[PDB]
Amino acid sequence: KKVLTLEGDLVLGGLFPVHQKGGPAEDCGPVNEHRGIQRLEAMLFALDRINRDPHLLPGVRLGAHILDSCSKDTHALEQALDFVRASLTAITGVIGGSYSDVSIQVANLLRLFQIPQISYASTSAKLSDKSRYDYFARTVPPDFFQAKAMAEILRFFNWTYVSTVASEGDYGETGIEAFELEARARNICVATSEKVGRAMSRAAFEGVVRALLQKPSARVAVLFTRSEDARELLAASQRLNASFTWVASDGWGALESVVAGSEGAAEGAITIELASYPISDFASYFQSLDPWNNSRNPWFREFWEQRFRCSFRQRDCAAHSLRAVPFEQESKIMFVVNAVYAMAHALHNMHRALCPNTTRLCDAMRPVNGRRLYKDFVLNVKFDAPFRPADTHNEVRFDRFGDGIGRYNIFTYLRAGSGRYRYQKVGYWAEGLTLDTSLIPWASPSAGPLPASRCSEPCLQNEVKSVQPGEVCCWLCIPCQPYEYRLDEFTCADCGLGYWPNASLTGCFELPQEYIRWGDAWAVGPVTIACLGALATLFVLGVFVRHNATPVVKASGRELCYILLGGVFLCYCMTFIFIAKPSTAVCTLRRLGLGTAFSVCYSALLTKTNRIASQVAICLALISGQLLIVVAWLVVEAPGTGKETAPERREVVTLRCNHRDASMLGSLAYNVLLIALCTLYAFKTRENFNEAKFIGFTMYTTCIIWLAFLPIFYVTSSDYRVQTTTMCVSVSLSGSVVLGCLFAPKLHII
Amino acid sequence: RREIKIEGDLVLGGLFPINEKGTGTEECGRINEDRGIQRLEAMLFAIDEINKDDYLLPGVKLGVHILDTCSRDTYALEQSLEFVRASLPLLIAGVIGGSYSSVSIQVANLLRLFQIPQISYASTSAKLSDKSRYDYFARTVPPDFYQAKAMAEILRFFNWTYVSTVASEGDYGETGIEAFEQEARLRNICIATAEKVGRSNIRKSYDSVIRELLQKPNARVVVLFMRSDDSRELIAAASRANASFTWVASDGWGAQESIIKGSEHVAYGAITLELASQPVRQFDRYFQSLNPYNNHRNPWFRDFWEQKFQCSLQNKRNHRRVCDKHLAIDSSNYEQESKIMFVVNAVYAMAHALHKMQRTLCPNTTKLCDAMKILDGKKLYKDYLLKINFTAPFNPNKDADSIVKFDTFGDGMGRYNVFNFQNVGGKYSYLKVGHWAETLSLDVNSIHWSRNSVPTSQCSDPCAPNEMKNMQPGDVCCWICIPCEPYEYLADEFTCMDCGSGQWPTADLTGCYDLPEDYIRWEDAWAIGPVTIACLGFMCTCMVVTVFIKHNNTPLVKELCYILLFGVGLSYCMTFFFIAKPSPVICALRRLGLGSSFAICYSALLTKTNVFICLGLILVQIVMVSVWLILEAPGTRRYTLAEKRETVILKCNVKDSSMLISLTYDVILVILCTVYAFKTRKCPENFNEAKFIGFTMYTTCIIWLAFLPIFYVTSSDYRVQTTTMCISVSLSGFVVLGCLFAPKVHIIL
Numbered sequence A: 001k002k003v004l005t006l007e008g009d010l011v012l013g014g015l016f017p018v019h020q021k022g023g024p025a026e027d028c029g030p031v032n033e034h035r036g037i038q039r040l041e042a043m044l045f046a047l048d049r050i051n052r053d054p055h056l057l058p059g060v061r062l063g064a065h066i067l068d069s070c071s072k073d074t075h076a077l078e079q080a081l082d083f084v085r086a087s088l089t090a091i092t093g094v095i096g097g098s099y100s101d102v103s104i105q106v107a108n109l110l111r112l113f114q115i116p117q118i119s120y121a122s123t124s125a126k127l128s129d130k131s132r133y134d135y136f137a138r139t140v141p142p143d144f145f146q147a148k149a150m151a152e153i154l155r156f157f158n159w160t161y162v163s164t165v166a167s168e169g170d171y172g173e174t175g176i177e178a179f180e181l182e183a184r185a186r187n188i189c190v191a192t193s194e195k196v197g198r199a200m201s202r203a204a205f206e207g208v209v210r211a212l213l214q215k216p217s218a219r220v221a222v223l224f225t226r227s228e229d230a231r232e233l234l235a236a237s238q239r240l241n242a243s244f245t246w247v248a249s250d251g252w253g254a255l256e257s258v259v260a261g262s263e264g265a266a267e268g269a270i271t272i273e274l275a276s277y278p279i280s281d282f283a284s285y286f287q288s289l290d291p292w293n294n295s296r297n298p299w300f301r302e303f304w305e306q307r308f309r310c311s312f313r314q315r316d317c318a319a320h321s322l323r324a325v326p327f328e329q330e331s332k333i334m335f336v337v338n339a340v341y342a343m344a345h346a347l348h349n350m351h352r353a354l355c356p357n358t359t360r361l362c363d364a365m366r367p368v369n370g371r372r373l374y375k376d377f378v379l380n381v382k383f384d385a386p387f388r389p390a391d392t393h394n395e396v397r398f399d400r401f402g403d404g405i406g407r408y409n410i411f412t413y414l415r416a417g418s419g420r421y422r423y424q425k426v427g428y429w430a431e432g433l434t435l436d437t438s439l440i441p442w443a444s445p446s447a448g449p450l451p452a453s454r455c456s457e458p459c460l461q462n463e464v465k466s467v468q469p470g471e472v473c474c475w476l477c478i479p480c481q482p483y484e485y486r487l488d489e490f491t492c493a494d495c496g497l498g499y500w501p502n503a504s505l506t507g508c509f510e511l512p513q514e515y516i517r518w519g520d521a522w523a524v525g526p527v528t529i530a531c532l533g534a535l536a537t538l539f540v541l542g543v544f545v546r547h548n549a550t551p552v553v554k555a556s557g558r559e560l561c562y563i564l565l566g567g568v569f570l571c572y573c574m575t576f577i578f579i580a581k582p583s584t585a586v587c588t589l590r591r592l593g594l595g596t597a598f599s600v601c602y603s604a605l606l607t608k609t610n611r612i613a614s615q616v617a618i619c620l621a622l623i624s625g626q627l628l629i630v631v632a633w634l635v636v637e638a639p640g641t642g643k644e645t646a647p648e649r650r651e652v653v654t655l656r657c658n659h660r661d662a663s664m665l666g667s668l669a670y671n672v673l674l675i676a677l678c679t680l681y682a683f684k685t686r687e688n689f690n691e692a693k694f695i696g697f698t699m700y701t702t703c704i705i706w707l708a709f710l711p712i713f714y715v716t717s718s719d720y721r722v723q724t725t726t727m728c729v730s731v732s733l734s735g736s737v738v739l740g741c742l743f744a745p746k747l748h749i750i
Numbered sequence B: 001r002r003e004i005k006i007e008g009d010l011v012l013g014g015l016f017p018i019n020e021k022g023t024g025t026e027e028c029g030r031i032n033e034d035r036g037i038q039r040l041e042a043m044l045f046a047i048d049e050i051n052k053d054d055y056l057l058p059g060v061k062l063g064v065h066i067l068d069t070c071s072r073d074t075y076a077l078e079q080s081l082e083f084v085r086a087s088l089p090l091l092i093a094g095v096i097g098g099s100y101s102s103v104s105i106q107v108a109n110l111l112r113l114f115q116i117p118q119i120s121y122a123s124t125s126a127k128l129s130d131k132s133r134y135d136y137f138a139r140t141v142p143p144d145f146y147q148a149k150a151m152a153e154i155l156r157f158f159n160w161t162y163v164s165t166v167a168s169e170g171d172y173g174e175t176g177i178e179a180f181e182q183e184a185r186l187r188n189i190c191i192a193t194a195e196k197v198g199r200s201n202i203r204k205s206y207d208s209v210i211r212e213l214l215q216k217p218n219a220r221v222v223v224l225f226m227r228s229d230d231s232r233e234l235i236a237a238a239s240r241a242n243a244s245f246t247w248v249a250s251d252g253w254g255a256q257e258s259i260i261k262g263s264e265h266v267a268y269g270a271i272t273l274e275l276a277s278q279p280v281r282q283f284d285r286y287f288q289s290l291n292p293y294n295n296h297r298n299p300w301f302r303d304f305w306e307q308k309f310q311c312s313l314q315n316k317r318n319h320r321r322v323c324d325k326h327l328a329i330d331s332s333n334y335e336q337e338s339k340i341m342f343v344v345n346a347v348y349a350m351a352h353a354l355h356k357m358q359r360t361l362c363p364n365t366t367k368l369c370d371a372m373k374i375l376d377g378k379k380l381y382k383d384y385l386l387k388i389n390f391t392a393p394f395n396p397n398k399d400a401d402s403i404v405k406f407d408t409f410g411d412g413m414g415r416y417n418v419f420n421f422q423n424v425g426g427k428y429s430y431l432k433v434g435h436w437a438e439t440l441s442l443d444v445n446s447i448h449w450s451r452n453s454v455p456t457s458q459c460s461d462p463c464a465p466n467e468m469k470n471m472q473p474g475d476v477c478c479w480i481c482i483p484c485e486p487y488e489y490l491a492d493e494f495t496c497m498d499c500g501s502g503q504w505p506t507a508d509l510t511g512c513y514d515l516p517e518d519y520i521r522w523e524d525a526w527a528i529g530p531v532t533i534a535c536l537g538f539m540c541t542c543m544v545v546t547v548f549i550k551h552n553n554t555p556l557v558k559e560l561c562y563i564l565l566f567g568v569g570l571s572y573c574m575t576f577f578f579i580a581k582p583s584p585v586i587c588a589l590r591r592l593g594l595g596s597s598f599a600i601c602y603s604a605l606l607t608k609t610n611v612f613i614c615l616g617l618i619l620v621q622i623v624m625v626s627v628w629l630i631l632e633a634p635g636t637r638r639y640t641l642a643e644k645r646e647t648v649i650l651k652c653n654v655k656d657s658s659m660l661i662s663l664t665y666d667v668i669l670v671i672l673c674t675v676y677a678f679k680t681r682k683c684p685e686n687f688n689e690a691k692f693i694g695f696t697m698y699t700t701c702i703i704w705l706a707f708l709p710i711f712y713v714t715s716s717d718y719r720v721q722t723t724t725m726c727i728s729v730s731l732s733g734f735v736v737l738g739c740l741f742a743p744k745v746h747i748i749l
């Protein structure tokens, strides 16, 4: 147990983490070179400067009673016991407390004796409560703003799925709770929450690293641990070949050789450190320190032997010095200087307000009471920084909770010369996040893809539902109803598709599709048959007109021949109307004309049998009788609208005439009349031998043409492609051959 | 400054929560009657019993310096400074106080600096088990490590895998809730919400926690790790929101009938855990005989009397009617606290440790010798307190559970009693419904639940495997069951996949059966038609067979006519072969039989147009035997990756196009030659049959137009293909019968 004591009228206490905590066999081991020794020397330098300042305490010399906490709260309490043992050298206030737990324990011990305490590194938000710490001051921002800064940093890079690890105690717990609260305020999810204990072993660190690696969707790790815990975690990650994007708090900071002892595991780590400026006077004072003239520091020999490895009492540690080697100031040095100067200013104000005549300690101040000082001068103090740069405006003041202003800096640990790893500032945080993306060599587009961390990757808009129970960390999207249009929520479709399947896959469109109607792309065959029939009947009609019905046409009556020409002519035209799109003006003719097409052909055969002028007129009127049934059916069949869609194969609409569905009923009635007329003539006659034989061929041809339609009808069954329209063309085309066969030998030999 | 200071050779410190937390403005307000007064009197009762004993510290009087912690660690630390003021004023050998975990930890941090042993009676925090931070600490109660595990088993017993956790900040609630999460993960227990209440909380703040618990109705069970005062506010807050929850609380609630003050409707059906202990019969008489007039050593007793009985004692009339002085503590209004024997054991443990120390450092004298004038706390704790073993002072069991001793960590043995709050007999009271001693054993047969039965606290509704497949959204407690295609079976619980093409899932969908449904059928609607024509046509062939030798010489037709009559007979049986449902070997016979049937019939007709005749006809059929000869045993099923997925038909898929091509070529050749050869040459024989055979030949071309053309389109159907085949073949056979009809009618006429 070493102690650093100096003489003076007023003695100020001190607590610094000079030594790092060891294992079970030793309370504390290696010397903390940057965070304990440099801070102790900064406090000593501040005290020396105050002791030579005429304006600040001209007649009062400030003493020092500084102790080493060995980075333990129990050891810190054991050391601070002698601070209050004298009260039962009196202590008017301690400038000490680097770790949050140490500061909390010291404040708890000191609140029973009314001893003010000003911290220089403790940033825990638990110390901001003035109900439990009535005499605790602090010159650093609390973690309440550091949590906001880290949450904003995570939100900036779309880091909505991260893993968190914090050290057990008083700093890690409050910080991680605040970070979780601020991440729930925004849209950030937490994957894994690990803890680091005080007696944490290497195997436990490996287990924590494995647990962190167990979540491949969270490539960003949020750190709220201490310096030693961060170093051990980095070593464990390095020895396990684990790569992570570390986002750490001020516990890591910009420590170059302390935490980043394994260069390579943390190459894109983002660290947040309290804003500070270098002090040239402190650098000059520290660079001139030697182990010979600095006899007032009991721990300087150990620091020398550690940073400049050699052996004392052997003529070995007498060549090197602190000037030639590079020197880097600790970030939390100006905070220690400000705390010491604030304590000195409070003491000076108390002396001025209590001893208005003498410049030394008058009898009214010799018992120093902490309550009055803390309530009057410690909290209500305002002065410029003792060693601030020329181009700045910084004031040392305490808020209502005795804290500092929430200003932070953002650092990244990059490599400059392929091995020269260093910390480079990339932004700051006072009220909002102002980051420099171009200064970070893993976020620029030229440096490669941005490392993102999401629980679920965003799937394509098409065939996605993103089912989410209330508010959930991440979503799962599944294809749903390919006939639905689109949706971005739990429901499969935001709008009703209706009879039109899906949409253009860009949202709610509900665009209509083509109906059952189709252009004559593959209907050339029906058209070709019509042209062949028209060409065949053109020559048949041409010879009849040229011969003036003299040779054979005027055999008996010369009337059936004229009527027969009309029947074949209208049969060819039936193919054209059937292959057209059903509309309000053309769809009505197909149903009415179907019965008439068979009636005219059958009438000619019936008229010939009846004959074997007036008869032709009677036959023409007889054919009109069958057309009356078509007109009667057309009373309701002519207006036809609707569709015959089915809950299958939604790509087709299947919209046609209402009479088209009823065309089967209409066709059945028409076919009945034609069949009966044809068979009666053939059997009755079974005149001229040639005429009688010719009638037999025509009578059988008409029946066989209609008979062959039945097997074809079952084949199609309204298939909408080569459908019942095809066989209607074929039977009409076959009927043209039937009509041609009647007159085929009439003029063949002429 | 109110305190109890009894003089004696050795003074034992005391810290009890006589006063509760208070409403901020005051350090501590109302008196804690159950956990602050009974425990305080239990320590005094034990001290008096020890001083009256002859085998425990004979001739040495034990003093007490008892202070009030006001249920807060900040005020307790100031009071604890009196115990260490002398070491920096009575000399304190040890401290028996410490009820709250936060209070005990703060005091232990200060006592370890002065080597003062401390024994706790109610602090169950697992943090205090660390012997590197709290060296001089012991307790007669188990840590929260076993308590958190005990409630995890209870949740697993009722399969409550989706619960909510409400805790309080400090050394008890935060530490206890951390252990619960670790135990919940091993039992697949998922946490819905994690709320924390603070020391400085208002009624609106407590209602915020209740509203947060109501955002997830699927979590009807709430796990509580709170203090006595914190639990009271939440229950009162839940009473103002008409919210009912299944409360599962730790020892902070226990069986204390003071949290539930006019709020029994919401706390009904709660499952609270209390440490296993037995009432002290001797303490029952001692507490029921204390009066404000005779009890003067307790400064807090007068305040306790004015609160429990609501009568004034200072001026005899301050709040209500005068105190009749005829009332006293009795079994009607007095119930012994659960942690009474622990206080007695804690006091006796320190007394027994000093007794063993006194018999070693003072070998001869029975008083306090010069060796024990300056007591050493390190030797008393490590060498005597940690290695103590004695029977309970007032125990009715005398079993192995009555032994008071400390383990390596200076803790007790984990034994908890499960209590259920229910309304029985018209009044509200607790009842033991289980016990936890390294094993859970409940009494569900006598547990009154909240609404009418065991609550269901699950994140996801458990979907039956009939048509639903579980899909994890990224967690292990909640899931969504999205159905998949009905022709795929789930493997075990989470994956439904197709077992190839041609199978159908089983009834339980644990496997897939082979597709049983087939399109083949016999004597069905689509087969009765074709067979009816076939049999009549087949019988028509027998009619020609009848006129074979009865009228042969008399007719002038006379064996080409007989050859074609037998040739078309193969056509009739070909229709019967086509309609047969199976095709193991006959499908090759169908193409060979039906294919040769046309060849024989057409060749015979062609022969009639023009020994030698038989040789020519046989030659055509001779090469038809080995047209393909590519086997017929395997029939490839027509089922494919179509929408049906429920029917399989083979139809002898092998070599389907080859038969059609061969038949078309043979049919095309015969019709052209036969028609050209016959024409009208001479019209020989009885009648002009040269044109008649041409008519039969011409009609067969139309029949040939029904073999190939109408086929190859819509013929992939099992029913359509078979029906078209027999109709076309039977029509051809009937046409040939027309040729022989004319000779037949001539004989009749």
Ligand SMILES: *[C@@H]1O[C@H](CO)[C@@H](O)[C@H](O)[C@H]1NC(C)=O
Residues within 6 Å of the ligand: A156, A157, A158, A450
């Ligand atoms: C994601 O990060 C980029 C900047 O790298 C930028 O687009 C924005 O800040 C974040 N959010 C979205 C929606 O892009």
Ligand SMILES: *[C@@H]1O[C@H](CO)[C@@H](O)[C@H](O)[C@H]1NC(C)=O
Residues within 6 Å of the ligand: B157, B158, B159
């Ligand atoms: C659920 O708990 C009950 C006991 O009350 C019992 O059925 C079983 O242990 C658990 N599991 C199932 C599937 O019931």
Ligand SMILES: N[C@@H](CCC(=O)O)C(=O)O
Residues within 6 Å of the ligand: A035, A098, A099, A100, A101, A121, A122, A123, A124, A171, A250, A251, A332
């Ligand atoms: N502010 C952090 C770290 C301080 C430091 O060591 O730099 C704490 O309270 O522990």
Ligand SMILES: N[C@@H](CCC(=O)O)C(=O)O
Residues within 6 Å of the ligand: B035, B099, B100, B101, B102, B122, B123, B124, B125, B172, B228, B251, B252, B339
């Ligand atoms: N088990 C509680 C004590 C409850 C009581 O008896 O007051 C704790 O550890 O704080």
